[PDB]
Amino acid sequence: YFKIYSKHTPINLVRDLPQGFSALEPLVDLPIGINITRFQTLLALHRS
Amino acid sequence: LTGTGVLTESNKKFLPFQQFGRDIADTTDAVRDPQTLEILDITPCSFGGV
Ligand SMILES: *[C@@H]1O[C@H](CO)[C@@H](O)[C@H](O)[C@H]1NC(C)=O
Ligand SMILES: *[C@@H]1O[C@H](CO)[C@@H](O)[C@H](O)[C@H]1NC(C)=O
């Protein structure tokens, strides 16, 4: 089971992690049943 | 989940994921009913010493 917990926060701090507390609600539980040891973030380019 | 009690209306703001509730003893104190998704409080039936 892949448990994904999520929390969305309106902030106005410029550079770093804001200092505070916010408990993450559970978003989804996925019955994937696979071995995971490595992960990748996916980004988007901007072209002009 | 089996048990005995009176099912009453409640004012506990359950979050969407949250289904049931537990007391210190871990006995269930509130439950979310299937089919209708409402939140029913479970209050033990009246008892006491004679
Ligand atoms: C999962 O992958 C890692 C690295 O490839 C390996 O060491 C581990 O034994 C694997 N686990 C299972 C259950 O296959
Ligand atoms: C059946 O239960 C689901 C919850 O799993 C609910 O969304 C749906 O409205 C229920 N339908 C009826 C006819 O009770």
Side-chain angles (χ1 to χ4, degrees):
Chain A
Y1 275 17
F2 203 70
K3 273 76 70 177
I4 306 187
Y5 302 80
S6 188
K7 175 55 69 176
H8 277 297
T9 298
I11 60 169
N12 210 33
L13 195 150
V14 183
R15 293 182 183 174
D16 211 0
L17 281 169
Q19 186 178 12
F21 183 76
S22 290
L24 267 68
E25 294 164 69
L27 175 62
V28 71
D29 196 1
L30 298 173
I32 61 170
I34 63 169
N35 193 359
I36 291 162
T37 55
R38 289 160 65 193
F39 86 103
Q40 296 298 110
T41 303
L42 292 183
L43 298 174
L45 301 181
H46 289 333
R47 306 262 194 171
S48 65
Chain B
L1 201 174
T2 306
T4 315
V6 307
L7 304 199
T8 59
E9 215 82 16
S10 81
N11 47 308
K12 311 222 178 308
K13 56 175 58 48
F14 278 25
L15 284 199
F17 70 89
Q18 268 155 2
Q19 302 294 301
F20 65 99
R22 268 184 173 179
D23 64 359
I24 318 293
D26 283 7
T27 76
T28 303
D29 60 32
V31 74
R32 180 182 296 263
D33 72 326
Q35 321 165 294
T36 308
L37 280 67
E38 174 63 341
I39 38 167
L40 307 178
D41 219 288
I42 304 174
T43 308
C45 303
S46 295
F47 74 108
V50 177

